[PDB]
Amino acid sequence: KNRAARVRVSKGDKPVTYEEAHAPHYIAHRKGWLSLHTGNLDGEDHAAERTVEDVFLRKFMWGTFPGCLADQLVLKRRGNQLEICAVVLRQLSPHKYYFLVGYSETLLSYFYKCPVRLHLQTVPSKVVYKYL
Template sequence: MALSPHLMKFVSESLKVRSVANRIIHTSSTLQKCQSGRYKKTLKNDFPLTYEMANPPHAIAHRKSWNSWNTTNLDGGLRASETAVEDVFIRKFMVGTWHALFVSEIIIKRQHNIIRIAGILRRSVSARKMYFLIGYTEELLSFWLQCPVKLELQTVNDKKDVVFKYI
């Protein structure tokens, strides 16, 4: 199929404009500059990374999707903005209540009307204080969010037990 001369002139002129614009702006492919979300390599390889931190950005959908199962962000989902605000509030409350004890990310799982909060803690407080903090956190968050809240916490002896690799 041959193009008409008028259409051929239009196509050639539009290609010239694009090529001139590319030389002036210096646009590059997005695949060449994939650096966001990556940690810089240190000289002594002494920077610890957890499993979540060690995953590259292109693997987020495959390896880290279980950290954010939240169906309110789907098209037509209800309460998308309220859920985001509640998640930020929950994370800030947990970090403030369990000060310097979390060695992993705080994972929030929403299933029906139950909110389950998971994470890994250092074993540096007594069992009595740990049980008090669990009850305190569950009770206050359940009251504020008007739904049942359950904590699923695991403990480790040292922060180094959570390190996946060093870079």
Template sequence: MLLNSCVGRFVNLQLSVCSSIKGSLQSGSTISWVRNFQTTSCLHKVVVARPKKTKRRTNPVTYEEIHPPHFIAVRKGFNSLNTSNLLAGTRSGETAIEDMFIRKFIEGTWHRLLLGKLIIKRRANLIILSGFFHQSLAPSKFYFLQGYTEEILAYVLKCPVKMEIMTCSDRKALVVTHV
């Protein structure tokens, strides 16, 4: 019942708009401009995935963030390497959800230690996670977190997981420039 009333209101609105447009036109003129009439807001596609510029150039930017998305596989690599997104690939949705879960799990487990983006590589049944981490913990705690992460993710995802850890002592080591 509710759907019928909503559809009826939409049709009445559409008819009233069309009749008002037709009535405002002079007789004999075409209404081809009605087909190009748009009511959505303007999308500024030139600013997508660009770092926000500041007046005093205080926004730190890494090498990966400098390049816009159309330079992926030209100047920079993918953050998630898998073949399930190819034509007729299987498990594309499941792979995307698993990648989101892995990123959130690493972000929570390695709290404030991950410096850049996490790279997820899938080779057959093996998942390889690599990233830059801050050296604020003792090496024994790093090894514990690495083993904990590998074991929990291997149990949840039902496939072997390996972590490649690269460490930096300075949090600003990955910053290339300021924008």
């Protein structure tokens, strides 16, 4: 039996989001890619450095906003710009969100030497696609 990135049926009480409810064979049929850059296009360079950056950014944001992220990040690259789109929860105070946005945007711009923006979308609770 295949295992890769499959949430397995339980007793019908496990809430899954739309992203985690779709197995890998749907990545270009029902769900899209969580990162969009040019590295993996034909004749394009630096796929390796883009990949390492994505892995770091996903871990940095998970620990920088502990318990706030409601779903996976969407990493966007346009030219020199890096745009991080995060769906967060409405539990942490707004003051603390603004502090962390100013802190993460500055710290990441100096680390990867590019203009970095963080776009937060707040949800009251995790969006449940189905109960498995």
